[PDB]
Amino acid sequence: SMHLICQSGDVLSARYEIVDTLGEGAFGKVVECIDHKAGGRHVAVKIVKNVDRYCEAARSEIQVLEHLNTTDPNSTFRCVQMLEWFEHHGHICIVFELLGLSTYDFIKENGFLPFRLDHIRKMAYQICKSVNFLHSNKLTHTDLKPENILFVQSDYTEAYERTLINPDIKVVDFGSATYDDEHHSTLVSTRHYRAPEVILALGWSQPCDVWSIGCILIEYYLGFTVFPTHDSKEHLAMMERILGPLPKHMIQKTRKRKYFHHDRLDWDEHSSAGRYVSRACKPLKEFMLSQDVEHERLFDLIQKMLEYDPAKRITLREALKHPFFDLLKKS
Numbered sequence: 001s002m003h004l005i006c007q008s009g010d011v012l013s014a015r016y017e018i019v020d021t022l023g024e025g026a027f028g029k030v031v032e033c034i035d036h037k038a039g040g041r042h043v044a045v046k047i048v049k050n051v052d053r054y055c056e057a058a059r060s061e062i063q064v065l066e067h068l069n070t071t072d073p074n075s076t077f078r079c080v081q082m083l084e085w086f087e088h089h090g091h092i093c094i095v096f097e098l099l100g101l102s103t104y105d106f107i108k109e110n111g112f113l114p115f116r117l118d119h120i121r122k123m124a125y126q127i128c129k130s131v132n133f134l135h136s137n138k139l140t141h142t143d144l145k146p147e148n149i150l151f152v153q154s155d156y157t158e159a160y161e162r163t164l165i166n167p168d169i170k171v172v173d174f175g176s177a178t179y180d181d182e183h184h185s186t187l188v189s190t191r192h193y194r195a196p197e198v199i200l201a202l203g204w205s206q207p208c209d210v211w212s213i214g215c216i217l218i219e220y221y222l223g224f225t226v227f228p229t230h231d232s233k234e235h236l237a238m239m240e241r242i243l244g245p246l247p248k249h250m251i252q253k254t255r256k257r258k259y260f261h262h263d264r265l266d267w268d269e270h271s272s273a274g275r276y277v278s279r280a281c282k283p284l285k286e287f288m289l290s291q292d293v294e295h296e297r298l299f300d301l302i303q304k305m306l307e308y309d310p311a312k313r314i315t316l317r318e319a320l321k322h323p324f325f326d327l328l329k330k331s
């Protein structure tokens with residue numbers, strides 16, 4: 001029904017000619033357009049689904065990008081540039097600079113092969129620098145995931161594996177981003193990248209994004225998420241498998257007391273769900289594919305990003321100084 005107003009050859013705002021579909025989902029559709037009033041430049045246009053959740057997210061996204069784009073006009077910190085917005089047949093339309101495939105789409109269209117370590121380093125630095133800029137501007141993204149990290153240009157080499165020519169990224173999808181001064185929603189983040197303080201409803205802020213990035217880097221390294229579940233209890237069980245027991249102070253503070261017996265997770269290891277967790281999940285370091293010190297440095301950084309206590313958890317400002325990033329500074 002939304003597709004009635006975003007077919008290729010359709011013209012939006014009497015200038016943007018749809019030439020292709022870049023993404024679609026519950027949120028709506030992103031389309032590649034020729035901009036006939038900017039010399040035929042190609043742009044991206046997000047056509048927002050006509051439902052509460054997405055309309056409100058889009059109105060907020062527009063406000064956040066005005067502020068971030070004004071603040072960083074050169075896009076030194078790699079937040080996508082919003083060119084304008086307008087309304088088309090009742091749909092909110094956000095115009096962006098054109099970006100390439102998401103890191104997710106790249107992984108998938110590569111048959112779920114992981115990224116090479118040298119690209120992971122360069123991507124992890126740009127993601128930490130980008131989201132650190134949010135964090136310096138009293139913002140938390142809340143929804144970082146591979147689908148929200150896009151390549152600037154996703155052209156690749158193909159050999160006996162696709163390899164990006166340029167692994168430069170930008171960060172998109174700012175409709176959930178929350179200012180420090182705002183009242184915080186309870187359910188933030190996509191299941192698989194959600195921080196323990198969010199699941200336990202302890203309150204969250206910038207550190208929940210650090211957790212999400214830790215989950216992202218391990219997914220780039222493995223080609224699969226390390227938290228493959230749709231259940232809060234199971235998710236906490238997986239965290240315990242990979243990172244050890246939760247701190248007692250977070251158990252004691254949570255209203256979700258039923259999840260815990262004495263001060264440990266009430267979880268049958270020997271149930272069908274318990275065997276699933278023991279199969280798919282194991283201690284973090286056992287996920288390393290080489291003992292090579294560069295792989296150890298990456299895993300040290302991920303471990304600090306997956307610190308349970310969001311106060312002790314490494315900041316992105318600290319992450320940028322991590323030794324894992326020295327091979328970028330060898331110049």
Ligand SMILES: Cn1c2c(c3ccc(Cl)c(Cl)c31)[C@H](C#N)C1(CCNCC1)NC2=O
Pocket residue numbers: 022023024025027030044046080096097098099100147148150172173174
């Ligand atoms: C392909 N694509 C997509 C987004 C873009 C935002 C900006 C730009 Cl330039 C592009 Cl190409 C986007 C969206 C945002 N924000 C999301 C919205 C839903 N989460 C993933 C990013 N989906 C896209 O396909």
Ligand SMILES: Cn1c2c(c3ccc(Cl)c(Cl)c31)[C@H](C#N)C1(CCNCC1)NC2=O
Pocket residue numbers: 055056057059060063175176177178179182183185
């Ligand atoms: C600027 N803004 C914001 C929200 C909007 C919802 C609807 C609309 Cl029309 C706007 Cl302008 C919104 C949401 C609320 N309440 C959130 C969206 C993202 N963080 C949580 C609440 N914060 C806003 O400042």
